[PDB]
RNA sequence: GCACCUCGAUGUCGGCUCGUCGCAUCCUGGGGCUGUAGUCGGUCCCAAGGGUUGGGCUGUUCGCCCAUUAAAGCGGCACGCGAGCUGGGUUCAGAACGUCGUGAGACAGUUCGGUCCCUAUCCGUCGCGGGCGUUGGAAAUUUGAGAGGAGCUGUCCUUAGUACGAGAGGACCGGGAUGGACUUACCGCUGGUGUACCAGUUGUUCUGCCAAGGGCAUUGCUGGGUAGCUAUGUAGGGAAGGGAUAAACGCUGAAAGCAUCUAAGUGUGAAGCCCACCUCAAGAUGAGAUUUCCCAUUUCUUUAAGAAAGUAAGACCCCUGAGAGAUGAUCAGGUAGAUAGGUUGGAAGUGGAAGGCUAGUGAUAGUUGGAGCGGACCAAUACUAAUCGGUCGAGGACUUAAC
RNA sequence: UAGCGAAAUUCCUUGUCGGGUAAGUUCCGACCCGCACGAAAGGCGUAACGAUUUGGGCACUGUCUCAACGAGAGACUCGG
RNA sequence: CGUUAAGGAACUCGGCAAAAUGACCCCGUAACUUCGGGAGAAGGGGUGCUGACUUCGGUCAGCCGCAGUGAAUAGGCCCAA
RNA sequence: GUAUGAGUAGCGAAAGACAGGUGAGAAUCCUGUCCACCGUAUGACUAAGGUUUCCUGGGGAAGGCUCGUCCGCCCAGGGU
RNA sequence: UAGUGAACCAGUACCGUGAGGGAAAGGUGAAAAGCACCCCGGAAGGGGAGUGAAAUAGAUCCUGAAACCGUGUGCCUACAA
């Protein structure tokens, strides 16, 4: 159909309380202590389970 | 499957010969007509098996007085006296449904003496 | 299963990716493609243990015919053809290994589409 | 599975060959029928002569559908055609002979004069 | 009264002793620990808490162990009740074996149905189609929402929302075998439940 | 009938999907009277719980007709329902017949053909999540304030050829068996689908060739088919009872020495009301009940139900998943391991692999051999992947009475 | 006048009889009482022809009784 | 877009849409008529591979499959107004 | 000039996958390999019509329905 | 947004085969003295240091209202038509 009215400034914001970006698990490494993702290959470290994996 | 094939090792029948689909078979039934107990006789061609253990079934085709009659039996009934394998035939299909539109002398099966 | 595309296109996809790793032993792709390549590669190394004619004549499905891989000469130019590599190298590598010939590692999302990406290796 | 406007056959000496159904008597909206039920019907082909002609409201009884019956044993019957026998409301056939096999389950509903005239009761 | 929980295994066929095929469900049990006794002076009831399986001891909490510890057993998964039983005859820690349903044979069976997701308004309620040809455009839709005059929609004009996942009894079923060595009751018919789910089995109500 | 209402536009009839309400009731249920012997009936009172059919004829309403049934109700809801469908009908531009008109044209006269646009903002209705409260923090189990569902019915046997009647015919109240329509769950049987399962087979092209195979031709076409999802398949349901009533019938008894169901008193009495059966249910802010688990640093704002930080019991994030799923949720697991993949075996299913030998001039046939293959199904097995981790989360107010 | 005639014309009208169907106001054959057919704004037959209008049979079938399953695109989740 | 048990126009204003026929070769073919037509009227039979013999077309013998223009393309018919 | 609708509808019929380059940055640019589509045309030559889009070397603010180190786009030379 | 349509490279760009129709667009500072040099970044863009009486006069460059979009905070808000 066609919207009947202008929605006010209040119901702009009362929708958008579920329009967020959130960040999931951030572990710290072993070889550098740097904040990186759980279960993921540590990119700057190049290690995972203490192994030169991304090498080659 | 673990418990079921332990619960039904008991009502099975071991009296059953070996037969492929496409083998002429006599089947003794058991018919209750009030208090009587007749033993009928059916002769046809085996077409099916429904392989499942407890509840395997098979089929038979008469052609009697023009009309063809089909009857499916389960295996493990006590209301079947015997199963008499009569012939053996060249078949290459597991389920012979193409018999449907055939009439008489174009629905014959061959004989292998085995 | 995992539907990805139409019917015959999955056969094309998995013949593409699993005739790779026979040659390179590393592959960088997405997540779900890696899981289908798990299953199909490990089904096609157990034929590398047998060495029969049925080992060859069932490898006529998931092997691209004219695909080379050369680290080889004596005084010649002599060419392994990426199925010969199964029946001469990867068989005797995992002659004593049971199932589970692969690794899948989780690196990064792709820049173009935010598709998370994945490394496959063998040992 | 026999409904309105479905063609049966006749297995009698009563000069009819085929039949349409009209109704499926007994109930207030019954859809289907099986072996051993009563049909209101008409006569749409006829051998010449005979007692029963075209255009007649005729009751009949179903023998040998192409989808037979479970029995309490566990066995089934599947015939190949559809046939019927004409009845004078006494459960007594008009014609003399009956051709072809006949299912057993007419005995459960007192069709004894039909059953004792069949060549075979299956 | 007679109440036993348990699993759900499958479907078989059993010849009876006059030679008749009958479809049969396969329901297990185990020994069955009574956990509490609820009386009028404490809860205003008369009821009994029962429980059927063995968890690992990794998979529970301290309060679950504090419930279990008055009966000296393993911590369990499923815990339910039973109302309207003349008690006596029940202590904290007894076992209710499979033997209670020898040929009681008049039994209500409860479970939970399967789950089928979002589906159309046909597959719940059996509302029929519209015509698929002669030029229409109304194949598989849920009707009209009502009249005009009340300027709203009356409640319960049922529409598309998730199929299955609620608990359903079936009344007056029979019992065929009781296998005490294997803890299996066999029942004629069909039971609402997916495999491995719970089933409560009680003596029936309507005599 | 009137012309208040809508002309910067409030779209007709029938049919389809979906219903809901009223009772001046069509069937089933309880009754009074009869010019009611019996089975049938006629009339009137109570009663809305459920049910109320398929086809032929025009566009139909309306109606006529066939075959059934316990019955084939009357009405309201914009003569219910077109931002849900149809557009046949009546109301566009073409053309024709009859009639009228000198004529252009016209006719509730007829005949063929002729366009139905919309991405749902707000309320509404169906399903499903996040936040907070429930006065310390938690894990489970649960009365039921209220609400929703279901509510129909035929035929046969037996009392009994009995009571009734000249015969003709032929019961009430009871007991039992078995169907129709509707509806709740399920895949063991019968069947359907089953596009990463098995085989046959045509054309062309490719892997150098013979042999063996891949691509494409609607999945190439054809013959079968596991799990899963399914009905026309299976199993079950409406039972038996209770309390207060409706119409109707009394018992006792007077006002009125009698009579009389009523004013006092005291009963019988229906598919209807409230229970009885199935389900939802403490956001029932009147926020319920039980079981089990957990016990304390700093500065002062000065001790006020103060702030702040580490924790317990426990939960979450992240990861492997399906008996779950639009997403989130639910549920099975996370090395105290069988959660998924693989491996070794099976099973359903297909129906005799390759290679070699034998017989054939060949097309082919026989044997090695119930062979070879095997998507979801069943056991076993840490081989691969659930590494290492991080975040949140209590220290329990007052008044009175009782000991 | 001949020739037609409840018709692309007929209000009353679903005129009356016959045929076709279990049941046929639509169709075909006949009657004449043509509200208001008629001879070049032509009358009455007609082989062949027609993306023409109308009535009826065979074969076929998810149009239907009464639906069920599978494939692809959209729809749904995340990035632009 | 693909498949379907049993029934086969009951749906509907109306068989609208789908389904069914479809290639080559042989037999056979009505009423009616303006004699040219109707007429591909209707209704039926055959088709693969191997060997032998082919005057030429083909003929005979054998083998296999449910199915031999094995895929794609390729007319539904009749009765009346 | 700026809102609402709303970060919604849409992104204009098709088959891609990997390795190695270059680069601040890569599914989208280059190279290799195999796979796939048309093939009385999605192949070759020309008549109008368009008017420098053609070639060589550089660039990424805007155009390209996303991205872009690339282009029928921008800068500078040069060819008929 | 006045005054010619046009204070600016205007009957121009743009539209219609054609006759024809026809816009928008003024302002740094007194003087260009229009930010040497360092720092992050591929750049764009910014932060220092300078020029200038003034840089919130930095080339979209005098003053800079309203709708509209944001940040921070004194008080209120989860039984309410
Ligand atoms: Zn690290």
The gap from C-alpha E146 to its chain's centroid, in whole angstroms, comes to: 37
Burial class (CB within 10 angstroms; exposed 0-12, middle 13-18, buried 19+) of C51: middle
A12 touches strand J (CB under 7 A): yes
Cα(E45)–Cα(E39) distance, integer angstroms:
5
- Residues 11-50 in B contacting D (C-alpha not used; CB under 8 Å): none
Closest CA to E2 of E82, E94, E76, E77: E82
Question: And the tokens for A16?
Answer: 């958008």
Residue-wise burial string across B18-53, b where 16 or more C-beta atoms lie within 10 A, e elsewhere: ebebbbbbebebeeeeeeeeeeeebebbbbbbeeee
Is E72 strand, coil or helix?
coil
Residue D67 sits in which domain range?
1-122
The Cα C28–Cα C34 span in angstroms is 9
Per the structure, the complete domain to which residue B49 belongs is given by: 1-114
Cα of A52 from ligand 1 centre, angstroms: 11
Q: Provide the residue range defining the domain that includes A31.
A: 2-56
At residue D14, the 3 state secondary structure works out as: coil
Which residue ranges of C make up the annotated binding site for Mg(2+)? 20, 66
Nearest to E71, CA basis, from E38, E48, E45, E94 = E94
Nearest CA in chain B to D103: B69
User: How do the residues of chain C divide into helix, strand and coil, expressed in percent and rounded to 5?
Assistant: 35, 15, 50
Resolution, rounded to a tenth of an Å? 3.5
Chain C residues inside the 8 Å CB shell of A27:
none
Distance A25 CA to ligand 1 centre (A): 15
The neighbour count for residue B94, using CB atoms within 10 Å, is 11
Place of tokens 């409301």: D89
CB atoms inside a 10 Å sphere around CB D120: 13
Question: In the numeric block, which tokens belong to residue C42?
Answer: 């490990």
Breaks (C-N over 2.5 A) in chain E follow: none
Residues D19, D44 contacting (CB under 8 angstroms): yes
C-alpha–C-alpha distance, residues D45 and D43, integer Å: 6
Residue D4, CB, less than 7 Å from strand H? yes
Q: Could you give the CA distance from residue C123 to residue C26 in angstroms, rounded to a whole number?
A: 11
Q: Which two tokens stand for residue E100?
A: 């209670």
Calpha distance B77→D71 (Å, rounded): 13
How many angstroms separate the CA atoms of C67 and C57, rounded? 17
Closest by Cα among E97, E99, E100, E101 to E31: E97
- d(Cα C25, Cα C37) in Å, to the nearest integer? 12
Which of these, D88, D101, D80, lies nearest to D11 by C-alpha position?
Answer: D101
CA angle D15, D20, D23 (to 5 degrees): 120
Residue whose tokens read 């209040």: A10
How many domains would you assign to chain A?
1
CB atoms within 10 A of CB A19: 6
How many domains does chain D fold into? 1
Mention every residue, 6+ apart, whose C-beta is less than 8 A from residue E57. E74, E75
What was the experiment behind these coordinates?
cryo-EM
Q: Measure the CA dihedral B18/B21/B24/B29, to 10°.
A: 70
Distance CA B114, CA C6 (A): 48
- Provide the greatest CA pair distance for chain A: 65
CB within 8 Å: B67 and D122: no
Name beta bridge partners: E122. Answer: none
- Give the side-chain half-sphere CA count within 13 A for D23: 8
Residue of C36, C97, C86 lying closest to C64 (CA atoms) = C86
**Token pair in block for residue C34:** 């890696």
Q: Give B42's strand partners.
A: B27
Contact C120, C27 (CB under 8 A): yes
Which residues of C sit in the known binding site?
20, 66
């Amino acid at each position: 159909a066609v919207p009947a009215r202008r929605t006010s400034k209040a119901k702009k914001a009362k929708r958008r309380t579920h329009y967020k970006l959130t960040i999931k698990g951030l572990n710290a490494c072993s070889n550098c202590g740097e904040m990186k993702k759980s279960h993921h290959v540590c990119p700057a470290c190049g290690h995972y389970d203490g192994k030169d994996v991304m090498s080659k | 499957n673990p418990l079921i094939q332990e619960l039904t090792q008991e009502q099975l029948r071991t009296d059953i010969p070996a037969f492929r689909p496409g083998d002429t078979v006599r089947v003794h039934a058991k018919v209750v007509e009030g208090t009587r107990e007749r033993i009928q006789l059916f002769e046809g061609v085996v077409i099916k098996r429904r392989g499942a253990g407890i509840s395997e079934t098979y089929t038979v085709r008469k052609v009697s007085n023009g009309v063809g009659v089909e009857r499916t039996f389960p295996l493990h009934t006590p209301r079947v006296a015997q199963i008499e394998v009569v012939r053996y035939g060249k078949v290459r299909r597991a389920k012979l449904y193409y018999l449907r539109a055939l009439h008489g002398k174009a629905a014959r099966i061959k004989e292998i003496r085995r | 299963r995992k539907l990805g595309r139409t019917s015959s296109q999955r056969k094309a996809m998995l013949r593409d990716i699993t005739t790779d790793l026979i040659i390179n032993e590393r592959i960088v792709t997405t997540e779900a493609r890696a899981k289908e390549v798990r299953s199909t590669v490990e089904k096609m190394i157990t034929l590398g243990k047998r060495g029969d004619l049925h080992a060859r004549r069932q490898a006529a499905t998931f092997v691209r015919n004219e695909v080379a891989s050369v680290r080889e000469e004596d005084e010649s130019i002599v060419v392994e053809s990426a199925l010969q590599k199964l029946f001469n190298d990867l068989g005797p590598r995992f002659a004593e290994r049971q199932g589970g010939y692969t690794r899948i590692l989780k690196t990064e999302p792709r820049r173009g589409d935010a598709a998370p990406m994945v490394v496959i290796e063998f040992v | 599975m026999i409904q309105q406007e479905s063609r049966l056959r006749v297995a009698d000496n009563s000069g009819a060959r085929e039949i349409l159904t009209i109704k499926v008597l007994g109930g207030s909206g019954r859809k289907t029928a099986n072996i051993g039920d009563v049909i209101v019907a008409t006569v749409k082909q006829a051998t010449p002569g005979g007692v029963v002609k075209k255009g007649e409201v005729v009751k009949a009884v179903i023998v040998r559908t192409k989808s037979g019956a479970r029995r309490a044993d566990g066995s089934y019957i599947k015939f190949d055609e559809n046939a019927a026998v004409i009845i004078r409301d006494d459960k007594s056939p008009r014609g003399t002979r009956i051709f072809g096999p006949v299912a057993r389950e007419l005995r459960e509903n007192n069709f004894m004069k039909i059953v004792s005239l069949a060549p075979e009761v299956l | 009264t007679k109440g036993i929980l348990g699993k759900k295994v499958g479907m078989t066929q059993i010849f009876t002793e006059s030679g008749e095929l009958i479809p049969v469900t396969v329901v297990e049990a185990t020994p069955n620990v009574v956990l509490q006794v609820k009386t009028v002076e404490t809860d205003g009831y008369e009821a009994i808490q029962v429980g059927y399986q063995d968890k690992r001891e990794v998979l529970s909490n301290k309060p679950a162990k504090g419930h279990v510890a008055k009966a000296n057993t393993a911590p369990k998964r499923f815990i339910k009740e039973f109302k309207n039983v003349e008690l006596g005859e029940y202590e904290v820690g007894k076992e209710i074996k499979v033997d209670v349903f020898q040929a009681g044979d008049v039994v209500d069976v409860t479970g939970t149905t399967k789950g089928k997701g979002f589906q159309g308004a046909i597959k719940r309620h059996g509302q029929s189609r519209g015509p698929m040809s002669h030029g229409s455009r109304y194949h598989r839709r849920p009707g009209s929402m009502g009249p005009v005059a009340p300027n709203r929609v009356f409640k319960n004009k049922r529409l598309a929302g998730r199929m299955g996942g609620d608990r359903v009894t079936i009344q007056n079923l029979e019992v065929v075998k009781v296998d005490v060595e294997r803890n299996v009751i066999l029942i004629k018919g069909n039971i609402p439940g997916a495999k491995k789910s719970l089933i409560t089995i009680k003596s029936a109500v309507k005599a």
